[PDB]
Scaffold this active site. Structure first.
Site, short mmCIF file in Angstrom:
data_model
loop_
_atom_site.label_atom_id
_atom_site.label_comp_id
_atom_site.label_asym_id
_atom_site.label_seq_id
_atom_site.Cartn_x
_atom_site.Cartn_y
_atom_site.Cartn_z
CB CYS A 86 6.91 37.01 -7.90
SG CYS A 86 5.25 36.48 -8.41
CD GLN B 70 -1.51 30.81 -6.53
OE1 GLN B 70 -1.50 29.63 -6.22
NE2 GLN B 70 -2.20 31.28 -7.56
NE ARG C 296 7.63 35.63 -2.93
CZ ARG C 296 8.85 35.09 -2.96
NH1 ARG C 296 9.91 35.85 -3.20
NH2 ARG C 296 9.01 33.79 -2.75
N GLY D 61 4.48 35.57 -11.46
CA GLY D 61 3.74 36.82 -11.53
C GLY D 61 2.29 36.78 -11.08
CB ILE D 62 -0.30 34.82 -10.23
CG1 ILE D 62 0.18 33.43 -9.81
CG2 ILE D 62 -0.32 34.92 -11.73
CD1 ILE D 62 -0.54 32.31 -10.57
CG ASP E 24 13.66 31.09 0.63
OD1 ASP E 24 14.52 30.49 -0.06
OD2 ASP E 24 13.81 32.27 1.04
#
Length: 498
Positions: free
Chosen positions: A430, A477, A436, A433-434, A396
């Site tokens: 995810c 990220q 993971r 959407g960027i 997480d």
């Protein structure tokens, strides 16, 4: 060219800087020293500086107590112009008007620091090509700088232009005096110096310091862990102002509620456009198509919202995708990152025009595989099998402690894709959407180069990530995801050499 980012001042130095050579509306960004991995946006207001905290999670950037964003640059662009409005304790606007630029070159691609003239020439001799350049601290050793450029057996040459540093400004030896090497470099990139005999010193790209031989990744990862992962990642972040492409469609009022996050939008030039609708043409998703100086492509997308399940299946069918990768757990940690969009096993459900029937679920350690049959209602024959690989064990916070779970996962995904002739792009989602999503896609791209070209090939993680980021904002990220990518490629590499 992200000029308002100061890669290491203190927040106290950032105050005096904004109060001395800034005016109300001045601002800068700097990395947080107290919250490693996060950022502070400092703003002058009524002759006083306030510091806005920006958290960089693995999924987005979080203006604390505000909106989420894909990148720092998109965040700043939002408030400087496009919509935005950042408000006070009460409801008074904090306006970002005047970027306060930094003169620090240490994060720039072209900057090499302490370096001899013979070592620079060897570097340009070796890895360089026409227009390749670098800026080093002065040989002849003053406290000046040298621009080394490769122009043109003797057909090629390395020219050394000296750069004077006088009373905090830079120049070659005539002309404009610049506030930083970056301004100098950008100026003479746009306006090439010409030699007395006509040679144009074109500055086409900094010398590549990141591409490596794949068989040699074990040593580079060692070097990077001792130059290093963080510096290499910051140098990539410093390139994000080149990626501020327009996202008008996601910004249309009619589409606002189709985004899980209002400011995390698909680039217009690559967004998936939904045809044969009723708007109805919009989904928060982009084609990712790898390109380098017959291939496998990807769709990067957010997790479904309740009102977008049906368009998600429209997308899957339209693009003839046969493989979905879900990188988030079914029950996460309390808050939904994705509404369930598939039937339970042996069940089936209509989603608008789209019918899908869950034929079988195979439970593995790190993932569930769901075999789904998608077809247009009324037209069985348009039916095709879609294989949903649901990755279950991603932690997480942070990344997995070993990448063997992801590598086996992606291996299965790749073989399934290959088993279906002319399958469309692999869908990957995810939460936004960027983050993971970006990690899984970059890893699969690099592993694919090595699968075709074998272990004696050239890979370049930053440039591959920059190429992906030009097709969806903020792919990959955090530094821990970035290291994860190198780690995953390493263990893959020391499995083929076996």
């Amino acid at each position: 060219s992200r000029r308002w980012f100061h890669p290491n001042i203190t927040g106290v130095e950032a105050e005096n800087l904004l109060l001395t050579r800034g005016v109300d509306g001045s601002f800068l960004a700097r990395p947080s020293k107290s919250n490693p991995g996060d950022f502070t946006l400092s703003v002058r207001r009524n002759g006083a500086v306030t510091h806005i905290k920006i958290q960089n999670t693995g999924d987005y950037y979080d203006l604390y107590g505000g909106e989420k964003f894909a990148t720092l640059a998109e965040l700043v662009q939002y408030y400087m112009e496009h919509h935005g409005q950042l408000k006070e304790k009460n409801g008074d606007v904090i306006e970002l008007k005047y970027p306060l630029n930094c003169a620090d070159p240490t994060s720039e691609r072209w900057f090499h620091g302490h370096l001899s003239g013979k070592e620079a020439e060897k570097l340009l001799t070796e890895k360089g090509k026409h227009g390749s350049f670098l800026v080093r601290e002065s040989q002849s050793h003053p406290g000046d700088f040298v621009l080394s450029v490769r122009t043109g057996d003797g057909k090629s040459k390395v020219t050394h232009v000296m750069i004077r540093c006088q009373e905090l400004k830079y120049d070659v030896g005539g002309g404009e005096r610049f506030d930083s090497l970056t301004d100098l470099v950008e100026h003479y990139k746009k306006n090439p110096m010409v030699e007395t005999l006509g040679t144009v010193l074109q500055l086409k790209q900094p010398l590549n310091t990141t591409r490596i031989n794949a068989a040699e990744i074990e040593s580079r990862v060692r070097e990077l862990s001792k130059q290093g992962f963080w510096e290499e990642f910051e140098t990539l972040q410093q390139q994000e102002c080149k990626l501020l492409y327009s996202r008008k469609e996601g910004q249309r009022q009619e589409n606002k509620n189709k985004n899980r996050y209002k400011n995390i939008l698909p680039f217009d030039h690559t967004r998936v456009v939904l045809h044969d609708g009723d708007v109805s043409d919009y989904i928060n998703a982009n084609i990712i198509m790898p390109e380098f100086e017959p291939k496998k492509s990807y769709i990067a997308t957010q997790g479904c919202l309740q009102n977008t399940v049906n368009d998600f299946w429209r997308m899957v069918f339209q693009e003839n995708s046969r493989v979905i990768v879900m990188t988030t757990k079914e029950v996460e940690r309390g808050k939904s990152k994705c509404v369930k969009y598939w039937p339970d096993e042996y069940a089936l459900k209509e989603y608008g025009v789209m019918r899908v029937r869950n034929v079988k679920e195979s439970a593995a350690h790190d993932y569930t595989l769901r075999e789904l049959k998608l077809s247009k209602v009324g037209q069985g024959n348009t039916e095709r099998t879609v294989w949903q690989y649901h990755f279950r064990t991603w932690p997480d916070h942070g990344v997995p402690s070993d990448p063997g779970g992801v590598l086996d996962f992606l291996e299965e995904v790749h073989h399934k894709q290959e088993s279906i002739m002319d399958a469309g792009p692999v869908v990957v989602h995810c939460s936004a959407g960027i983050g993971r999503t970006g990690t899984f896609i970059v890893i699969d791209i690099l592993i694919d180069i090595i699968r075709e070209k074998g272990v004696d090939c050239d890979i370049d993680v930053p440039k591959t990530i920059q190429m992906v980021r030009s097709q969806r904002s903020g792919m990959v990220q955090k530094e821990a995801q970035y290291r994860f990518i190198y780690m995953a490629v390493q263990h893959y590499i020391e499995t083929l050499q076996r």
